[PDB]
Design a protein around this ligand. Structure first.
Ligand SMILES: *Cc1c(COP(=O)(O)O)cnc(C)c1O
Ligand SMILES: *Cc1c(COP(=O)(O)O)cnc(C)c1O
Ligand SMILES: *Cc1c(COP(=O)(O)O)cnc(C)c1O
Ligand SMILES: *Cc1c(COP(=O)(O)O)cnc(C)c1O
Ligand code: NA
Ligand code: NA
Ligand code: NA
Ligand code: NA
Lengths: 380, 380, 380, 380
């Protein structure tokens, strides 16, 4: 039939894939090749990566997909394909770190100017648009406090003023949020997170209209970034995404239990999780997201030293900066990642001294809660 | 000891690699991971790719290496790290195709201007340099007639006028040519060709000073192209380069036999191969290159239709646009790759209607010569 | 801590694995090596496969694990380690096909005699035991009608008469059944099915006492079958088993829905599924198994030609002889696998002309039911 | 054409392989699958492993090939397919270690008796043959002193008395010796050594008549050992064997240089290498082998402690028990492998206290000789 007609779990398993016609092999073969041969002068890929691109296009409800070497390369291949010297971008402030350096330093050195705004306030996006604006760029939920962006409202604003909307959907995966259905033009992912889900692949994906994807492929990849994804990485990502539906269900079930535990804990001052009623944009989240996600941020009493003591006291949670793996991962941005940054700068970059970020995995939630309770008790 | 002190074949086998300290594993483990874990807050890669980078740095006699997703990404990560709007590049005209589009269209849209010159004439390079020139870019030997560029002379010119020299060494590999030893600042490769050699990896490498490579890594890769190489691709390239010395010796031994056969054939009007005395820059080749290479170009009598008939008549040689594999590969640019291009344009892009390009593999040269003789006889 | 102390889902994720001490890599590195190096004469693996063996030992609650090249090799390495000429085996009749040939022909040619019994009747096992009996061998649930064997009762019988009990736990996985906890001495799996779960690995595992596993390793593998598992296959199986808990939950949830649908369908004469109340050993199943499994057998009205027409009319279910993959798979033994076998022989081997076997995958059960309903309607 | 008609180097590159018809992929795809799908009931592998089997069959000049999980499994799958209780085997004494345990202990426990003889004396083979003898089994060259066996003469003897001849050709590879051309019936290899050559694959291969190979596959593998090779291991072996010709040429060129150096060294009492004129079977070697091999044994003055001191003093050669890798490997059996064995037993098992075994790699021979000279000087 047509894979676009089946239920979402069926699509997760089947879309973009079929038994090998030649051999009947059910698994997508790994076409680990660089060389393709022609039969004739007149009549003179990659099939593995093509399957991944088609599957993700189906899952995001877009026309076409393009796999890349990294999440970074998905974003830069996209924006460098769309923009040239003299052009302008309006970008959310609450965005991924390496994206910020690309937008803050790299783009301006190529004559491409960027205005950063608080995208939780759609009026700030509107006010920053210029005749030269080609692209509005947002991420949602956004780090570090998991604030949201109203995709449908921002898309309407962008389009009225003649710009494209590009959305980073990494945190959600297509299982939980579909920006193209809400009016975005282009979706990008780091598949490194939930789409692969197994913490063993660095890669990205771009999904959008065929017309744009062809330009991203034949100009962006070929003539600017060279950021192709290897066939083995595509095969692993295909393998990982088979369990996307059941993984996201369990991630989100576990995260909600852990978030409620943290909200009831007197040593925890704040808990940021879209699944909690006290989230500032809770109702927007319920319309825009099918599940509240696997990521939690929370603030422990006692600031910087309590945060340090807490992550040094966990025994099951692993200390790492990654997200979306099968293992529960924990990090303390003020002592770890943003440690060279001046306090007052971190402080309304949104990173308080006591802020902890947690990527909830597939372990028994009882074991994770026990580990957290033990570490919090010690840290305070 | 120090791997920088052993003979070149010993370095090919050993440089950048050692038994795994933890386990004693002799093969470099495949660190197929995205996530790395920290032991503490205070104390809070990729090891496979690191081994490849160190090996190639040793082989090129450079300080440091940086692996990339493709040969394209090696070149663009390099140039986009070095140049910003307002800067200038002097580039050889006789360069790889996708490189030309990057230099002709992409760079100028970022405000970076490029002048193309005939790099076989070092005076044209000098005459094109401007106060804004940051980089001189060359490839040697160069397609399609395997003309050469005098690296040492061009390096001297570039440096006197305050620019860096970047050399694409893909065609030669470090076994046959070492541009850094001749004064180049930066070497780039598509490892897709001879360094891997097995036609199953797309990838690139950049080699140069530690100071530059750190910028290419932490700014170029991280903040512009995102073009990282996957650990499995790095492991395969490490595996392939183990036989670099013995592969290049046989490629070049076979190519010289085939080139001499073609030079004696009355249906072949011209043969381009640096190992032949009639090559226009033969003596330069003997000083600059340790072996004349595995690539041959030649012109068959009868123009476009003879070229078409010839490649349609080979039965052992395979029709493909790739180079540097273990199989002998053949292509006819006028009918294949550059077929949409207007004849008169191709004609002193250097591509005549009868031009055939041959990548000589590891087969018995007698079998390749027999296949060629048969196909030439039919085609004419 | 000790991985033997956490909840089962936590064990699935973490047991046998830890961040690489040397590098911090979270994923288990792929030690694709044959050679291990020594530091000295005095002081003169595989680490990937070791992680898999330790994980499965923890999940089955056994002391030690041994990975093999195939499910077949797990069974034969076990039995050939335990038995020599003159010894005797009592085996269930309702067993996997290739196992039957090994037991029926191969063992007797080595002087090892085998008696086959109906293991659903523990008294038949007792009556077949001899002074020479070393091993009782069973599989449960058993094909093709998913009959059960009471592991605890059979273990007691075997042990009283001085024999070991070996159980094939492939159909269940350790998530759903733990034979060692019920008194079995040794468990074997084809990891090809649910433990890997992704239809891309052929492999086996043996779990039991350290004393036995050492003999299976240093004598069975090294000196009889040579059936080692490759490190890459072990790494893929480690990756697959990460989602074992969530996969089995969904397989079993989907299978129960599909089984109830089939039980209500007037064109379906019988449905065999341990989760249905009418299963002959339903209560035994509830004590012995935590979930009823992902495999269903059923008989369609109209015998051989209806069965043929049905499998030729499915459009989502895939025709294959495999089990335990993420895709729903279907087969018709009488027309497919056992087609060369005489009808009357198949008929109380348990294989009726109308019998269909179904491996339920991770698709939306509504889509699978719709596909089945369509195919059944056509077939009848 | 027919790959059986090209030169041996051409066969090494091309035999068993072709561009993928479906996609044009030049590299053999990795069919990492367990499941194969059928299109119909009526019409209801592995393609990667099949390519390897066909290539090695062509190279050994046999009809068919069968890949296995290990060299051990190649040997045991073969012999257990051929022999049953009551049968007899005549085997060389000078054979690989794990093979000896299989033949000495395992076979007799299955009622299969084995007589061990000195196969350098063909008359000992004849004298040991019995009416029950099914197989004569030899290895050549043989460890540890690299003695030879006259394959053609032994084949004639075996056949006159109605037995098959099985030859282990691991040490030589098909590039240097072709036992089937000399009258052997069956050839086995550990591909772990030279056929793969890169020290990262454990695997075996069996080559012989189609009639036998079908029995080894459908009975030996399926119903006795279960020792299949994984598709990824087959793909790596295919990749490794591409350079077999150029690797063996360099291994043997380097080994001859090193052997001549050792023969001239006054601290070295004996050197065992078929390429040296003083080898006891030198002329037989020249008829039977195209090159003298990459393996050298030699005795250092001063017995056990000198041998220990020597291997502890090398700085380039690596200490390991493996053979046939790209790195030079060294071992001292009396202190390392056979250390638990009583001296007088080792002593005319052929292992003297001063015996060193060397696997010569692809490094510059000057560097290896320098390392050896340094270590020998220290050790004495
Ligand atoms: C991690 C991340 C990226 C970058 O992904 P890589 O594959 O590591 O480059 C981009 N966007 C978001 C939202 C991320 O979390
Ligand atoms: C093929 C080639 C490249 C590009 O390599 P990819 O890995 O295919 O991007 C660059 N330079 C030269 C000289 C080449 O031949
Ligand atoms: C498939 C199967 C086996 C054999 O597994 P392989 O890995 O294919 O050898 C053994 N036992 C049972 C119960 C099976 O279903
Ligand atoms: C190493 C070796 C074997 C066994 O090979 P594995 O792949 O390690 O089982 C068999 N025969 C010979 C001659 C060997 O050297
Ligand atoms: Na699939
Ligand atoms: Na190595
Ligand atoms: Na892990
Ligand atoms: Na090939």
């Amino acid at each position: 039939s047509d894979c676009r007609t089946y239920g979402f779990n069926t699509q997760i398993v089947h879309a973009g894939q079929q038994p090998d016609p030649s051999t009947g092999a059910l698994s997508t073969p790994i076409f680990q090749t660089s060389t393709f041969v022609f039969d004739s002068a007149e009549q003179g890929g990659n099939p593995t990566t093509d399957a991944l691109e088609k599957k993700l296009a189906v899952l995001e409800r877009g026309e076409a997909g393009l796999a890349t070497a990294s999440g970074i390369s998905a974003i830069t291949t996209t924006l460098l394909t769309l923009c040239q010297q003299g052009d302008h971008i309006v970008s959310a402030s609450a965005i991924y770190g390496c994206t910020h350096a690309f937008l803050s330093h790299s783009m301006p050195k190529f004559g491409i100017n960027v205005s950063f705004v608080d995208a939780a306030k759609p009026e700030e996006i509107r006010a920053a648009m210029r005749p030269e604006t080609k692209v509005v760029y947002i991420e949602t939920p956004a780090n570090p406090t998991l604030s949201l962006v109203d995709i449908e409202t921002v898309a309407g604003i962008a389009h009225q003023q003649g710009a494209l909307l590009v959305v980073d959907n990494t945190f959600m995966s297509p299982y939980c949020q579909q920006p193209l259905q809400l009016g975005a033009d282009i979706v990008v992912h780091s598949v490194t997170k939930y789409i692969n889900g197994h913490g063993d692949v660095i890669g990205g994906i771009i999904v959008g209209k065929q017309e744009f994807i062809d330009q991203a492929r034949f100009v962006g990849l070929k003539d600017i970034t060279g950021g192709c994804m290897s066939p083995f990485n595509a095969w692993l990502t295909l393998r990982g995404v088979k369990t996307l539906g059941i993984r996201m269900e369990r991630h989100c079930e576990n995260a909600l239990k852990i978030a409620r535990f943290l909200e009831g804990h007197p040593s925890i001052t704040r808990v940021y999780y879209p699944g909690l009623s006290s989230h500032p944009q809770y109702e927007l989240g319920q319309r825009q997201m099918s599940l509240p996600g696997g990521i939690i941020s929370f603030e422990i009493a006692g600031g910087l030293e309590a945060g340090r003591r807490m992550i040094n006291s966990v025994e099951l949670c692993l200390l790492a900066v990654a997200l979306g793996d099968t293992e529960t991962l924990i990090q303390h941005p003020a002592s770890m990642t943003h440690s060279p940054v001046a306090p007052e700068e971190r402080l309304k970059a949104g990173i308080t001294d006591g802020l902890i970020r947690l990527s909830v995995g597939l372990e028994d939630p009882e074991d994770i809660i026990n580990d957290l309770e033990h570490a919090i008790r010690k840290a305070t």
